[PDB]
Enzyme design. Structure first.
Site, PDB file in Angstrom:
ATOM      1  N   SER A 118       4.388   1.709   8.120  1.00  0.00           N
ATOM      2  CA  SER A 118       4.033   0.780   7.062  1.00  0.00           C
ATOM      3  C   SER A 118       5.253   0.268   6.296  1.00  0.00           C
ATOM      4  O   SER A 118       6.139   1.045   5.922  1.00  0.00           O
ATOM      5  CB  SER A 118       3.087   1.457   6.076  1.00  0.00           C
ATOM      6  N   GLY A 119       5.287  -1.044   6.065  1.00  0.00           N
ATOM      7  CA  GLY A 119       6.383  -1.650   5.327  1.00  0.00           C
ATOM      8  C   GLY A 119       7.592  -2.020   6.161  1.00  0.00           C
ATOM      9  O   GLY A 119       8.472  -2.738   5.696  1.00  0.00           O
ATOM     10  N   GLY A 179       2.933   5.726   9.534  1.00  0.00           N
ATOM     11  CA  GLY A 179       4.239   5.979   8.958  1.00  0.00           C
ATOM     12  C   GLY A 179       5.228   4.833   9.031  1.00  0.00           C
ATOM     13  O   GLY A 179       6.306   4.908   8.442  1.00  0.00           O
ATOM     14  N   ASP A 218      -0.736  -7.057   1.522  1.00  0.00           N
ATOM     15  CA  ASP A 218       0.040  -5.830   1.650  1.00  0.00           C
ATOM     16  C   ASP A 218       1.532  -6.176   1.661  1.00  0.00           C
ATOM     17  O   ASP A 218       2.162  -6.173   2.714  1.00  0.00           O
ATOM     18  CB  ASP A 218      -0.347  -5.094   2.935  1.00  0.00           C
ATOM     19  N   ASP A 250       1.799   0.110  19.868  1.00  0.00           N
ATOM     20  CA  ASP A 250       1.442  -0.437  18.564  1.00  0.00           C
ATOM     21  C   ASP A 250       2.289   0.284  17.515  1.00  0.00           C
ATOM     22  O   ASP A 250       2.941   1.278  17.824  1.00  0.00           O
ATOM     23  CB  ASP A 250      -0.067  -0.199  18.339  1.00  0.00           C
ATOM     24  N   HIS A 269       0.798  -1.218   0.000  1.00  0.00           N
ATOM     25  CA  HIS A 269       0.000   0.000   0.000  1.00  0.00           C
ATOM     26  C   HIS A 269       0.839   1.280   0.000  1.00  0.00           C
ATOM     27  O   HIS A 269       0.315   2.379  -0.175  1.00  0.00           O
ATOM     28  CB  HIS A 269      -0.985   0.014   1.182  1.00  0.00           C
TER      29      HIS A 269
END
Ligand code: PI0
Ligand code: BGC
Ligand code: FUC
Ligand code: CA
Ligand code: CA
Ligand code: CA
Ligand code: CA
Ligand code: CA
Ligand code: CA
Ligand code: CA
Ligand code: CA
Ligand code: CA
Lengths: 254, 142, 191
Positions: free
Chosen positions: A192-193, A190, A90, A186, A41
């Site tokens: 992500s990946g 930002g 994803d 958590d 994404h």
């Protein structure tokens, strides 16, 4: 990252920073001098595919030093089953234009074999998630790499313990939940990946990717990661394949 | 038990229940009180469940009320010590003791393997780096 | 396959065995146990039994709170078990009076300090070794009228009328406890 701490420089050597047009975009995980695994994404709205940059050896986005190494992303391979704007599959495999130099601050995370990851690693309670993402929900990103230890959950418990929302995405067999449901810790947007690295008998392996979730550290909710064990074969087959013309490549999956 | 005329004799727990098997009545006659009789009769009539010698592989049975407990030898476990802690060298059991990769095999013993950049030492379970920067290792901590 | 259910803990003197249902018909099971922050350890691999001895795992720290889940095969179907804190929930076995010696107008009733499944240095620790001060034994005796007595050790020093005879019964008890605070009464013994 929410509720975590700074990763001492060099203690998160496989962390990758993805920049598009010099701007911060997402995180990544180096698995060999030539390939980087990130989230799919992260490319939903990329226009200049020729302006993707992957930086390794990063730590403090405010100070440069010689541990930093830049490489143009030569190719972004997303599964053909991934759907922009959505959550399933994803995942993304990125080929760097030039290989990175392995140093004390730049080292790859091991891509484990499928069974080993499903049979063993997946049963290691804790794993590390990191990135320069938001330190708070809707908050501002971090300047220094943040790292957080999060417990893993089997989908059944994740669901049973997560309070249903207005038709949120399903948690498939291609993802898994980790984190807490009390609003304390958590990963976040930002991030992500970035990697969900698991420590096992002296070696760290790639078990997940910061993917999605209901906000960041929302009470009664967990963070969702791409279940990488489900793509081992996909990745290896591709890493052995020859480069494609354009940057973006949608490879069939399975 | 009740021989001829012995009932003319007062009651004795010894001669009647220890030295012989005494029914509930004979016991009730020694204790008189209902509850005292019932508190005694529970253990007296339960019957030692260790008689079957359920505990295996040199274990030790400890009798309880309508049950037993098996104390096993180090290399065993399970309700009756039937489980061989040595017969569990499969991959799903602690990754088969392997440091990295484990491979089960029909009948034989499992085999261990390593990730690229590592090699299997002669112990057939460990892995060591065969390059300067093997994946998964943190340099500044090694 | 059908996920297991009614998972129950059966524990006495730390001899802990998880049980469940139903009667396996085309399905095998695999148990996993862990501590709230520990890694999941498998047990009773692909067993066809509806039980699993988890004694060796829980005795590693009777003060921990273990959770268990039973995996069902023909992520797989599973069912989690109730939380289990050995120290606070293991049932105390049936006591056994070791003896009692008379010394004039008093009696010394001795409770046998049975052993537990808790291994420590090549030996089984006794109920006293484990619970220390948390454990007391109560005596329910009578002149062969009810009488009681409690001790913080494994013995009772009581007064008795010369000539008359007595019968005795004892119980293991962990006062602090909320669940299974007492064991069943030991066999009756009379001098
Ligand atoms: C049901 C709506 C979700 C699908 C959606 N939830 S959300 O609340 O909208 C996210 C959010 C949170 C904070 C500020 C902004 C957005 C979501 O998660 N959408 C995806 C993109 C979907 C895409 N393909 O475009 C997304 O934002 N992924 C990044 C990410 C990584 C880690 C976490 C975490 N550890 N929790 C959370 C989010
Ligand atoms: C010995 O006796 C016990 C009594 O419960 C029984 O369960 C066993 O099967 C037998 O061997
Ligand atoms: C009873 O306990 C078991 C564990 C073994 O030590 C036996 O030899 C003993 O009789
Ligand atoms: Ca920097
Ligand atoms: Ca007789
Ligand atoms: Ca008689
Ligand atoms: Ca006789
Ligand atoms: Ca006699
Ligand atoms: Ca009678
Ligand atoms: Ca009689
Ligand atoms: Ca009679
Ligand atoms: Ca008995």
């Amino acid at each position: 990252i929410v509720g975590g701490k700074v990763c001492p420089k060099g203690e998160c050597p496989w962390q990758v920073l993805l920049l598009v047009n010099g701007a911060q975009l997402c995180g990544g995980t180096l698995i060999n001098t030539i390939w980087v695994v990130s989230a799919a994404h992260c490319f939903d709205k990329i226009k200049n595919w020729r302006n993707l940059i992957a930086v390794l050896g990063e730590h403090d986005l405010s100070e440069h030093d010689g541990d930093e190494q830049s490489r143009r992303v030569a190719q972004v391979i997303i599964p053909s089953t991934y759907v922009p704007g959505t959550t399933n599959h994803d995942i993304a495999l990125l080929r760097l234009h030039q290989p990175v130099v392995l140093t004390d601050h730049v080292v790859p995370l091991c891509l484990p074999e499928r069974t080993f990851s499903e049979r063993t690693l997946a049963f290691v309670r804790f794993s590390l998630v990191s990135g320069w993402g938001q330190l708070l929900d809707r908050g501002a990103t971090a300047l220094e790499l943040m790292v957080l230890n999060v417990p893993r959950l089997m989908t059944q418990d994740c669901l049973q313990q997560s309070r249903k929302v207005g038709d949120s995405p399903n948690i498939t067999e291609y993802m898994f939940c980790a984190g807490y449901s009390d609003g304390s810790k958590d990963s976040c947007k930002g991030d992500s990946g970035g990697p969900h690295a698991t420590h096992y008998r002296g070696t760290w392996y790639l078990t997940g990717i910061v993917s999605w979730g209901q906000g960041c550290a929302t009470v009664g909710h967990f963070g969702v990661y791409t279940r990488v064990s489900q793509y081992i074969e996909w990745l290896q087959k591709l890493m052995r394949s020859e480069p494609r013309p354009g940057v973006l490549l949608r490879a069939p999956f399975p | 038990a009740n021989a001829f005329l012995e009932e003319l004799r007062p009651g004795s727990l010894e001669r009647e229940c220890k030295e012989e098997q005494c029914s509930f009545e004979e016991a009730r006659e020694i204790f008189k009180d209902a509850e005292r009789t019932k508190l005694f009769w529970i253990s007296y009539s339960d019957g030692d469940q260790c008689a079957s010698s359920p505990c295996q592989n040199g274990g030790s049975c400890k009798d309880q009320l309508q049950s037993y407990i098996c104390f096993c030898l180090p290399a065993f476990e399970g309700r009756n010590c039937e489980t061989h802690k040595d017969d569990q060298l499969i991959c799903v059991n602690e990754n088969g003791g392997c440091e990295q990769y484990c491979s089960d095999h029909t009948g034989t013993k499992r085999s261990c393997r390593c990730h690229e950049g590592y090699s299997l030492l002669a112990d057939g379970v460990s892995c060591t780096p065969t390059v300067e920067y093997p994946c998964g290792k943190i340099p500044i901590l090694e | 396959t059908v996920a297991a259910y009614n998972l129950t803990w059966k524990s006495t003197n730390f001899k802990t065995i998880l049980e469940w249902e139903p009667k396996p018909v085309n399905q095998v099971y695999t148990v996993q146990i862990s501590t709230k922050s520990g890694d999941w350890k498998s047990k009773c691999f692909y067993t066809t039994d509806t039980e699993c001895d988890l004694t060796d795992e829980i005795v590693k720290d009777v003060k921990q709170t273990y959770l268990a889940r039973v995996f069902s095969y023909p992520e797989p179907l599973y069912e989690n078990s109730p939380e289990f804190t050995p120290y606070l929930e293991t049932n105390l076995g049936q006591p056994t009076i070791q003896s009692f010696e008379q010394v004039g107008t008093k009696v010394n009733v001795t409770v046998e300090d049975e052993r537990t499944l808790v291994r420590r240095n090549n030996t089984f620790l006794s109920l006293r070794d484990v619970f220390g001060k948390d454990l007391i034994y109560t005596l329910y005796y009578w002149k062969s009228g009810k009488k009681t007595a409690k001790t913080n050790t494994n013995e009772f020093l009581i007064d008795v009328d010369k000539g008359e005879n007595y019968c005795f019964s004892v119980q293991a008890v962990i006062p602090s406890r909320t669940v299974n605070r007492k064991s069943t009464d030991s066999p009756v013994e009379c001098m």
